[PDB]
Design a binder for this molecule. Sequence first.
Ligand SMILES: Cc1cc2nc3c(=O)[nH]c(=O)nc-3n(C[C@H](O)[C@H](O)[C@H](O)COP(=O)(O)O)c2cc1C
Ligand code: SF4
Ligand code: SF4
Ligand code: SF4
Ligand code: SF4
Ligand code: SF4
Ligand code: FES
Ligand code: FES
Lengths: 430, 54, 212, 66, 41, 230, 59
Amino acid sequence: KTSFGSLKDEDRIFTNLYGRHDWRLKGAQSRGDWYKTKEILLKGPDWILGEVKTSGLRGRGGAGFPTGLKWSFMNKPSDGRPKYLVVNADEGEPGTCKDREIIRHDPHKLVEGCLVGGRAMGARAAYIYIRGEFYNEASNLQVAIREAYEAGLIGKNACGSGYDFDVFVVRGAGAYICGEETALIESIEGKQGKPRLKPPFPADVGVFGCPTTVANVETVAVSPTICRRGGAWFASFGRERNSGTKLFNISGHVNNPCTVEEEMSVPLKELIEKHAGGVTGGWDNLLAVIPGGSSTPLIPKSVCETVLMDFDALIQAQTGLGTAAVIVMDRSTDIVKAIARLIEFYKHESCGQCTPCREGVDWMNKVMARFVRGDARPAEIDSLWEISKQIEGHTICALGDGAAWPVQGLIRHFRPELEERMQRFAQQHQ
Amino acid sequence: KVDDAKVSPPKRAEMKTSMESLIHHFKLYTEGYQVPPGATYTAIEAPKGEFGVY
Amino acid sequence: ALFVHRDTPKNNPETPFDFTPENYKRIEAIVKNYPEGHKAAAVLPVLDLAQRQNGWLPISAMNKVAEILQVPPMRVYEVATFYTMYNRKPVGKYHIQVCTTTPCMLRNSDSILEAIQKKLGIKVGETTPDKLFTLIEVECLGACVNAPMVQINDNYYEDLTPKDIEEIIDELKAGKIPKPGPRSGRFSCEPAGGLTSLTEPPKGPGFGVQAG
Amino acid sequence: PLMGWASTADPLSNLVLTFSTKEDAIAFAEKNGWSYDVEERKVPKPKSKSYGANFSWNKRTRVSTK
Amino acid sequence: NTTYKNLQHHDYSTYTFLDLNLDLSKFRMPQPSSGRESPRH
Amino acid sequence: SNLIEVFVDGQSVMVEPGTTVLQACEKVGMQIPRFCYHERLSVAGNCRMCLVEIEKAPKVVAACAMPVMKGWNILTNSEKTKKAREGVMEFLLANHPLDCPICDQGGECDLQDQSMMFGSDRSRFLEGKRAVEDKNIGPLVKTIMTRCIQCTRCIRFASEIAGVDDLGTTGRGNDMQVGTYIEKMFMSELSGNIIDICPVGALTSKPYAFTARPWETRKTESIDVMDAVG
Amino acid sequence: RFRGEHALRRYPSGEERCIACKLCEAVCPAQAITIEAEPRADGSRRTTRYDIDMTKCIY
Ligand SMILES: Cc1cc2nc3c(=O)[nH]c(=O)nc-3n(C[C@H](O)[C@H](O)[C@H](O)COP(=O)(O)O)c2cc1C
Ligand code: SF4
Ligand code: SF4
Ligand code: SF4
Ligand code: SF4
Ligand code: SF4
Ligand code: FES
Ligand code: FES
């Protein structure tokens, strides 16, 4: 086994992070896209399902379900209705920075991923839902799909076999919950973006009631290299319940905020210090750490100096995991105002099916505005703990969960600073 | 009074500035509070004597 | 934020709205994509085409899209009021969006709001007393690994400073549209020191693959 | 005429009894003498609804708004 | 090799997305019908 | 032969296949308090009041649209069931204003009955409480959209039985106005059947509006005229 | 805190304070209150007739 590992090159799954040697179908053919994929896709979808369930791929995008079991849910037999693959390329979660750079720098590997994913479950076509804020990269992806079709390579007679497979690009119109799993499915139908109830599962009812599925761009792009590359060599990184090269990226208070592709098991302290400049003012100056992006509670310093970057380790630390905000925030800034701005973000971006998320994000935003002013009593802050215990599990989607957790984390860790805030305003009044 | 706004009415301050207090005021005076089914008897020591109510 | 129509002419159909048959060729492409039986699904890209063909969309455009896609208009009004791209208020040519939620405010977004404020003159949310400078502050755009960022029409501006902001202001007043890339070095998302990321050019079809 | 009230010469017009079955109702109505009508009970019919049926493919049962 | 090889997106106008999808309409497998032509036919 | 076992508090009963929890609970004698569901309307999961606890699972699931899988045991009288009902009754009365005098639905508001029998006694959320400007559907329908609990019952009714498609949701977050975007006087047949759909006093009768109040009005059986059906 | 005359009040420099919300007829334990309500030419809800039987009023 390994002693928790570190960074090492040629363990990188996908290359061309930024500014690399070229981009074209010829550049993808030189880097290693469109290599012998007829041999792979002319073998059988259950072979790719066995390959993925061998790989132990953890489903990215902060949900937590494994990819192979979800795709095995998709292996219902052949009925009289078509089947779709929906590649979600959204970046909500302020921080996210996940696949903007990826879809600007390597779309042909994404086409590889959606083609292998469609073959692996008998899909008929794929819709790529790009975020509407990304018009230039939607044009670049259109150029890549144009060249892929122009090689006569997907569509009718895709890679020799008589297998029809198309890809479409649908822009968003500016939203947050279109990143979510089923409001996507209704917004592709042209209806206003609103999720469905989960116990009718998307594996049976999808785009107007066709069995489709939704996959995230990291999982899609990493999927065909599992086929063309080593069986469970990908699984040889970090742990065995969860493994892979994930995009651990820092946007916050560092020098050169940026992206790295690393192993799943890694010390977060040595990640932050030894891959993005350093923490501005040294390690001792920083206030706190958030992993996850925005649906994840905060971590203080003494905890994060022992944290390895695994899903099970962060659930043991009672957090989740996400993309590109695995960051610190420094001491001189107000974490009160930071989390209050996060809750204002959630109020400006949430749909309104569920009564409790609407009303709860309303209370939490007005109460955090009062706490930024510092104008309550401590009974109010324990009532805020109570309401954030009331929301979680009572919503359709998990934006209510992602709104309820940072309030919980703030009350878990920075109790006395809020108490001092309220005391300062009491002496200001008196 | 009791710590229950389903039997005793809420007082004026929370009545004029709440929502649920106005709801419980309104339905408490119109409908009447519900009383669970059963037969009871009790008696106090009134100055006449064993004043019973059934 | 004004979710009721309230006719008040310069609105109130019929205000003359009309396409080009080349746009009808685009709509043929868009409803050539979707499966037949669901002509009612192209509302979002057709309505975005209406926004790009008339920079703020009127309600006559909404009735005309409802006439084409044979849906009742109330669903079109739902879609046009739900999302954020569709600006029902009349706006100018250039639309400045200071993107500011969590990392952007944490890296001094207020410098940029105050710079655009006391250079342009008008306040946030509202607009200039001419065209082409509707300023609003907006939620996260995605590219968080760079500065509190600036979206103009289909263009991003990253890794900021007030002086290149002043260059953007004067060159938009004149008519020079600058580069889409970031500023102050590191032309993309970079660790902007000395490549702690990958250095060797990858091989591809010349090393070991697994049976394919 | 003095107040606009509703004076009624109807002593029995404000009695209403609550029973548990129709047979005891008929038995009491014949026991206590007067005539009676039986408006029979009409319970709500059970139906079958599902959200997966609300999102069908070719079938027209479609909410088209949510 | 540190020369930025994109910014071929420097020249994209407001309509190149829809024009590109318009030029990419043919050689497409026929996108089937299903029952009625609409939920209200 | 299409008879599925559920245990409502330990009592077994046999259920049709592909039906909800709520139909089974109405079959055995219970009622779960419910808002956005209605038995002549298609099922939506908006109101989040139909909640109940299913044993051997952490998540409290909805029961207006859970199809009955095999062998349930339903906790309608557990602790967190009543705690979730208390929480949602606290949320629905947050943004609902102080109009219970001048409402038209004193005795017949759903919120008042379910707030007494299922919700808390004391309120919270000292500040806030948004307000919505009203619309004018027509001379028959008085409309005070501040009382609208955003339940989406009138919209499904219009779009599935009236078919007029004039009532939709517009907006996001807290600010979701239900109705017509374009000030069009929604007038059609069955427009009178929407003052009884709306469970709160948001949509009320205009020619009745301020004349009585339901406990004084005694009820009397009758048969319609002027139509062939009655 | 005596109980006498049965007066009504009105707003400061304003109109009547009642609404005809019928709570007092619902709670009058001899039902001496009688309220018949109509709205006037404004739109705000008001009354037509508001009666106390001083015989049946038990104070
Ligand atoms: C609040 C919320 C926000 C989400 N945002 C995104 C997003 O921006 N992009 C995305 O691809 N998926 C997003 N998702 C969906 C998850 O990534 C989920 O994993 C996805 O449905 C399937 O991804 P998987 O292939 O990793 O299973 C979001 C989900 C939730 C609950
Ligand atoms: S929790 Fe809020 S954002 Fe999520 S589905 Fe419910 S109403 Fe929409
Ligand atoms: S609809 Fe509103 S104002 Fe009317 S009784 Fe109900 S809670 Fe009170
Ligand atoms: S007006 Fe009434 S029925 Fe319609 S959404 Fe509001 S509360 Fe529901
Ligand atoms: S009807 Fe009676 S209880 Fe109601 S406001 Fe008027 S006087 Fe008061
Ligand atoms: S009897 Fe007199 S004091 Fe008592 S409620 Fe009636 S009017 Fe008021
Ligand atoms: S918050 Fe400004 S880019 Fe994400
Ligand atoms: S009844 Fe409203 S959510 Fe099930």
